[PDB]
Amino acid sequence: RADKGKHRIGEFWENFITKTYKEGNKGSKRMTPKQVALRVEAKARELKDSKPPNYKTVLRVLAPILEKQQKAKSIRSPGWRGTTLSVKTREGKDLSV
DNA sequence: ACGACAGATAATTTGTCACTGTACACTACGCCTTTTGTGGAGATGTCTAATATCTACGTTTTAACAGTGGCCTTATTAAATGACTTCTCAACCTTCAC
């Protein structure tokens, strides 16, 4: 279906969840989804919104973001091949070997 | 035929709640190296005014004596003394007296 992977909480909450997790993981802060959901609870109460998102949705919202943040650890480097070689000096001069 | 009305129906997400994997078990900003501009002596080099020394510059002063200049009256006659000069330095015979 056209709806697969798209949430029904809507554009405001999809942003607010992802906004809150994103600010909570810059610097050495390490705000995990549960603390975000606890913010979402606080936000709905002060927004007077009677139906805050459940923690399972918040974890499902961030699951692709978390996976994109994970993949960055794995990306492999091709390396040099064959006989021809050079080494990258900080002068910016590639010295052939 | 196809596709086109209103509604079925297989998804899709929202939300529950039993379950479990894991950290809490204190245990990084600290060990070590290098450069480096600032800083403290401390041997050494720098180089003058000045208070003489250290003779000479020569310049005064002395006395010795050398030369110029003024004065000094001149005559005669006598004396003493010392000298000089000149001249002289015979000899036989006769006569009258005892």
Side-chain angles (χ1 to χ4, degrees):
Chain A
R1 296 155 62 94
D3 217 26
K4 193 170 71 72
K6 302 172 190 167
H7 306 102
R8 299 180 178 169
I9 62 181
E11 174 270 353
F12 172 59
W13 289 115
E14 287 183 40
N15 280 283
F16 183 82
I17 291 162
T18 54
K19 179 190 298 183
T20 302
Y21 180 83
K22 283 171 182 290
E23 72 172 22
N25 291 270
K26 53 74 171 185
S28 291
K29 303 174 69 176
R30 292 297 177 265
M31 188 180 301
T32 38
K34 174 71 83 162
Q35 296 93 322
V36 179
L38 296 170
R39 224 64 45 68
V40 173
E41 173 63 26
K43 191 73 180 79
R45 181 59 193 100
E46 72 91 32
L47 182 61
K48 325 302 174 176
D49 182 344
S50 59
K51 295 295 295 183
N54 173 289
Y55 166 69
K56 258 294 196 176
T57 72
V58 173
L59 184 60
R60 285 172 186 132
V61 168
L62 297 167
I65 287 158
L66 273 39
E67 181 59 24
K68 296 309 89 75
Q69 288 193 332
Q70 197 288 334
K71 192 189 66 162
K73 286 89 181 184
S74 197
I75 299 166
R76 188 171 195 270
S77 284
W80 277 83
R81 293 289 303 205
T83 294
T84 292
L85 175 60
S86 74
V87 296
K88 177 64 155 60
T89 70
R90 197 180 294 215
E91 303 92 284
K93 203 287 181 182
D94 300 359
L95 172 55
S96 66
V97 188

